[PDB]
RNA sequence: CGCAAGACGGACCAGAGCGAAAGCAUUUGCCAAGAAUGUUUUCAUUAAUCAAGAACGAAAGUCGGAGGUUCGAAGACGAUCAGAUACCGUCGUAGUUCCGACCAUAAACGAUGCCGACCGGCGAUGCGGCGGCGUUAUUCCCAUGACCCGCCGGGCAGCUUCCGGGAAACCAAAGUCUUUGGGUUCCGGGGGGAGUAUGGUUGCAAAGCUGAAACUUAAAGGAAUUGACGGAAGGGCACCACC
RNA sequence: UAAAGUUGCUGCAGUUAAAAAGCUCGUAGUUGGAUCU
């Protein structure tokens, strides 16, 4: 953010965060995520400070924007909660998505069909996307992760403190990352709300899709 | 040979030897 | 080479543990090292439950159970197949069998 | 005690719990407190009452084991003995 | 046993993915189309491939199977990926907020918001599973 | 951490520590002035007093020794200094 | 149904506690001791490790005196075995128990000296202290006891380890080691001969402590890797197997 | 004699390869906290 008034977090962002439950973490706390939480509720849940969340999201957006080729940014989600959000982020931003199983050796085995050498690496959950995070330590690949209170920070260079468990929170987090990346690039402005609503990134389980239709 | 039994045999040898020596 | 970190027993911070006798062979085995089974079994076997129930003087008697604590040496516990040998990695699993 | 009219007349001679009951109340993550007194009644009968009590886990206990400390066990045993003596 | 080997399984998967248009549910029609659109060098293997194609057609008529990526089911799935509700699920008139997160928002310079309803904190600190 | 500041620790983080492990050690104890209904004079009582403190104006004990802080009897007002 | 003897103290009993170790579990009382915690108490370097010396030291064993239930070296029988006088079974003596006096040895083991610093994380657990929503118990005014959520100190443990180290197994110590020095005690120098001979010394004895050499040898050994094998387990298979 | 960092003060080793005394006191020995311009 840089303390700029233009990059400050608005009331609409806080409304979205509270509606999605992004500020609500887990009952456990990683010792490297202590600087991002605010307090622990009477039911043991740690509250994630949304100032720090916005700061880390803007830092991650800066890191993504610094990658000149958008395709050199890789977005990963093995869990289905963040899969559709990852595809939407890649479509809007231009990054290369890996939704589902991450084949081991994707970054290290040059004699392989699905071999790619990204310049940046973004994952929905360090604990669930541990394979690409481990392989990023073989190819000098910096990593951005959406980290809960209990997320491990090994090989994570920019941890965005957020609830990565709930579908609403994951979708909102990926949507805001895409929106901030686009705003920093120049495409779409920050004077009027973005035309894409956050629910385009939310995961819909089979029960939900059957009920809705 | 088991070491315990080797020690036992050596001890019996010493017992006989000290029996014969006065 | 050390096979187990706890030396196959559950003794920490003490010198001596009183021995017990294996229920099969009567071997003197330390209580911490011994393999203990607590068997809570119905006195009437499941095949005979219906026949005993019908011949009962009292309706709704709920038959009693048997409470026997079993102590085993390592040899007899392995032979009886209460415990089995495990891999070097699965040896560390202390969770009781889910059954 | 005596037989008249081909009826055998009995008296209280002892009381006990069934083996299954006692074995069922002895669980593994609690303290069992036992006490006994030799106390005479007012008609010359000398009794030896045995009392057993077990430590209870609270309805919101997260701790696996509920153990009374040694002084707590001694106080419980003293109360057991006092109550039995007062009641006999 | 009647386990189909990788040859017939993979041939059936490719035939279904590539010519899903022509294949149906009948063994005889599947046999004929499989003979037409593929060079199967044996008739026993052709019949095995056609039989597994019929089995997999029954499989995919009842939902999506992971080995085959036919264009119609992919189009349906992608259409489901673009579904957007009329009103955002985050557009709640009232958001229930605990007192501690309200204090955090106060420290966050967001304390004047009227969408927030302060809920009673749970007076029980019983949030951990009992040990054992 | 890898960059935690030791010269300027947070006050809560210093009250958390052991009294000897703080940057500058300081006791967890204090002295209180305890008023009794049976008297008027000043009775300064150590918070961790090991003695039975008696009010000179009555037959009422002021505090009782305990493994830690002294147990002040109900009905006495104590004001802590420093 | 009782009576009498000795022995033992099940379940509760836990990778729980205490003790320098050996070791320690029925109630109650007495006697002396002890760690940790708390302390804005006192003294003010009184300390660490330790040749010489000293206390304690499982079991077995020895000498006296009791006791002698059970088990049981020795021994006597009975047993499928080619052959037990082994394993199994029935008996059974010293012992096993207690009181004195010896003995001073164990895989007496964490096969890891002690004292002191620094170096990750987490969840528990024992003790003491401190703080805090709430739930439960003694007349309706409070502590306090049992829970609950935490913090601090010591302790028994549960840990990756690409901090780090190792030959590795593995070890938050077995780390802070060729980037080698915090203090100090004991102690090893290829395998055998050999913990033997001899001398001394202790002991009633059994034996304990200290303890060689001639000679002999190219390996012995540690960790792990693949195979083979197992009168080892799990899952399958075969009328060149069986049923 | 060097090689032998296989006598190690520089500079070895003692969980499993050879190895920490069963344990604890203890005298000599060795070592010993801050602080004076």
- Asked if residue A1 belongs to a domain, the reply is no
Which residues constitute the domain of residue E10? 1-61
Q: Are E20 and E71 within 8 A, CB to CB?
A: yes
Q: Where are the domains positioned within chain F? A: 1-82
Residue E17's CATH number: 1.10.60.20
Which helix (DSSP H) or strand (DSSP E) does residue C71 occupy?
A: strand C65-72
Number of CB atoms found within 10 A of residue A33's CB:
22
Q: Is the CB of C1 under 7 A from strand H?
A: yes
- Tell me how far apart the alpha carbons of residues C12 and C5 are, in angstroms, rounded to a whole number: 11
Residues F42 and F54 sit within 8 Å (Cβ to Cβ)? no
Indicate left, alpha or beta for A144 from its phi (over 0: left) and psi (-120 to 50: alpha).
beta
- CA-CA distance, E76 to E69, in Å (whole number)? 12
Which chain D residues are closer than 8 Å to C66 by Cβ?
20
Q: Is residue A4 part of a domain?
A: no
Instruction: Please enumerate in sequence order all residues whose Cβ is within 8 A of that of E92, keeping only pairs 6 or more positions apart, or say none.
Output: A19, E115
Which residues span the domain enclosing A122? 13-213
With contacts defined as CB-CB under 8 Å, which chain D residues touch E126? Answer: 60, 62
Can you list the pairs that E20-28 forms with residues at least 24 positions away whose Cβ atoms lie under 8 Å? E20/E68, E20/E70, E20/E71, E20/E72, E23/E53, E23/E57, E24/E57, E25/E54, E25/E57, E25/E58, E25/E61, E26/E54, E27/E51, E27/E54
Searching chain D, which residue's CA lies closest to the CA of residue E126? D60
Q: Which residues contact C84 (CB under 8 A, 6 or more apart)?
A: C78
The closest of A143, A125, A127 to A83, measured between CA atoms, is A125
- Specify the residue for token string 């037989």: D3
A100 backbone φψ class: left, alpha, beta (φ>0; ψ -120 to 50)? left
DSSP A119: S
Cα-atom radius of gyration of chain E, to the nearest Å? 29
Q: Which of A211, A205, A208, A212 is nearest to A79 (CA)?
A: A205
Nearest-angstrom CA–CA distance, D80 and D36: 8
Give the closest residue to A162 by CA, choosing from A133, A198, A125: A125
Number of domains within chain A? 1
Integer CA distances (angstroms), A179 to A81, A207, E88, in order = 19, 29, 16
Task: Give the whole-angstrom CA distance, residue E101 versus residue C77.
Answer: 57
* Nearest residue: Cα versus C1' of G41: F50
Resolution to 1 decimal place, in Å: 2.7
Residues of A in contact with E125 (CB under 8 A): 42-44
- H or E, element range at A144: strand A143-147
C 4-63: CB within 7 Å of strand H: none
Q: Residues 6 or more apart from C4 whose CB is under 8 A from it?
A: C91
DSSP per-residue codes, A174-187? HHHHHHHHHHHHSS
- Subunits with 3+ Cβ pairs within 8 Å of F are none
Q: What are phi and psi of C36, to 5 degrees?
A: -110, 130
Give the containing element (helix H, strand E) for C63: none
Query: Distance between CA F26 and CA E67 in Å, rounded?
Result: 71
Handedness of CA A179, A180, A184, A185 (dihedral sign): negative
Yes or no: domain C1-99 corresponds to CATH 3.10.180.10? no
Query: Within chain C, what is the greatest distance between any pair of CA atoms?
Result: 63
- The CATH number of whichever domain residue A21 belongs to comes to 3.40.50.10490
How far apart are alpha carbons E119 and A45 in whole angstroms? 15
CATH class of F1-82: mainly beta
DSSP A17-74: HHHHTTTB--S---TTSGGGEEEE-TTSPEEEPHHHHHHHHHHHHHHHHHSSSGGGEE
Strands (E), chain D: 2-4, 7-9, 32-40, 46-54
Cβ neighbours of residue F28 under 8 Å, at least 6 residues apart? F19
Yes or no: say if A129 and A76 are a contact pair by the CB < 8 Å rule. yes
Phi/psi region, residue A70 (left: phi>0; alpha: psi -120 to 50; beta: rest), is alpha
């Amino acid at each position: 953010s840089g303390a700029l008034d233009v990059l400050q977090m608005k009331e609409e962002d806080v409304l979205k965060f509270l509606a999605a439950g992004t500020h609500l973490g887990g009952t456990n706390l990683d010792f490297q995520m202590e600087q991002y939480i605010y307090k622990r509720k009477s039911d043991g849940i740690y509250i994630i400070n949304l100032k720090r969340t916005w700061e880390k999201l803007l830092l991650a957006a800066r890191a993504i924007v610094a990658i000149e080729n958008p395709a050199d940014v890789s977005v990963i989600s093995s869990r289905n909660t963040g899969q559709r959000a990852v595809l939407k982020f890649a479509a809007a931003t231009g990054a290369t998505p890996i939704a589902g199983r991450f084949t081991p050796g994707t970054f290290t085995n040059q004699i392989q069909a699905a071999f790619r050498e990204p310049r940046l690496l973004v994952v929905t959950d360090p604990r669930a996307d541990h394979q690409p995070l481990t392989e990023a330590s073989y190819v000098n690949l910096p990593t951005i992760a959406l980290c809960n209170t209990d997320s491990p920070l090994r090989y994570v260079d920019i941890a965005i403190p957020c609830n990565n468990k709930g579908a609403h929170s994951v979708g909102l987090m990926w949507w805001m990352l895409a929106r901030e990346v686009l705003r920093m690039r120049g495409t779409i402005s920050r004077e009027h709300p973005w035309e894409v609503m956050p629910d385009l990134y939310f995961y819909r389980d089979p029960e939900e899709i059957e009920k809705e239709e | 040979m088991r070491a315990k039994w080797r020690k036992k045999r050596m001890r019996r040898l010493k017992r006989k030897r000290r029996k014969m020596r006065q | 080479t050390k096979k187990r970190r706890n030396n196959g027993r559950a003794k920490k911070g003490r010198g001596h543990v009183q021995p017990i006798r294996c229920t099969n062979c009567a071997r003197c085995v330390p209580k911490d090292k011994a393999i203990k089974k607590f068997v809570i079994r119905n006195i009437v076997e499941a095949a005979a439950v219906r026949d005993i129930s019908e011949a009962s003087v009292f309706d709704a008697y709920v038959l009693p159970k048997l409470y026997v604590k079993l102590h085993y040496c390592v040899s007899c516990v392995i032979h009886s197949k209460v415990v089995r040998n495990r891999s070097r990695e699965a040896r560390k699993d202390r969770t009781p069998p889910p059954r | 005690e005596d037989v008249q009219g081909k009826n055998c007349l009995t008296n209280f001679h002892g009381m006990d719990l069934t083996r299954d009951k006692m074995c069922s109340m002895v669980k593994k993550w609690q303290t069992m407190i036992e006490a006994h007194v030799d106390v005479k009644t007012t008609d010359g009968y000398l009794l030896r009452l045995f009392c057993v009590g077990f430590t209870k886990k609270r309805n919101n206990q997260i701790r696996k084991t509920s153990y009374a400390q040694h002084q707590q066990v001694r106080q419980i045993r003293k109360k057991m003995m006092e109550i039995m003596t007062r009641e006999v | 046993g009647r386990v189909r080997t990788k040859t017939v399984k993979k041939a059936a998967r490719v035939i279904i993915e590539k010519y899903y248009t022509r294949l149906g549910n009948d063994f005889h029609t599947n046999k004929r189309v499989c003979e037409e659109i593929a060079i199967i060098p044996s008739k026993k293997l052709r019949n095995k491939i056609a039989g597994y194609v019929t089995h997999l057609m029954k499989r995919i008529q009842r939902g999506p199977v992971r080995g085959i990526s036919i264009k119609l089911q992919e189009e349906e799935r992608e259409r489901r990926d673009n579904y957007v509700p009329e009103v955002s699920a985050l557009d709640q008139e009232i958001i229930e907020v605990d007192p501690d997160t309200k204090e955090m928002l106060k420290l966050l310079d967001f304390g004047s918001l009227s969408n927030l309803q302060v809920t009673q904190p749970t007076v029980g600190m019983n949030f951990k599973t009992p040990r054992g | 951490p890898l960059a935690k500041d030791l010269l300027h620790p947070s006050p809560e983080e210093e009250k958390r520590k052991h009294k000897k492990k703080r940057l500058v050690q300081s006791p967890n104890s204090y002295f209180m002035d305890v008023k009794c209904p049976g008297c008027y004079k000043i009775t300064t009582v150590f918070s961790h007093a090991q003695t039975v403190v008696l009010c000179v104006g009555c037959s009422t004990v002021l505090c009782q020794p305990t493994g830690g802080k002294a147990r002040l009897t109900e009905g006495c007002s104590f004001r802590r200094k420093q």
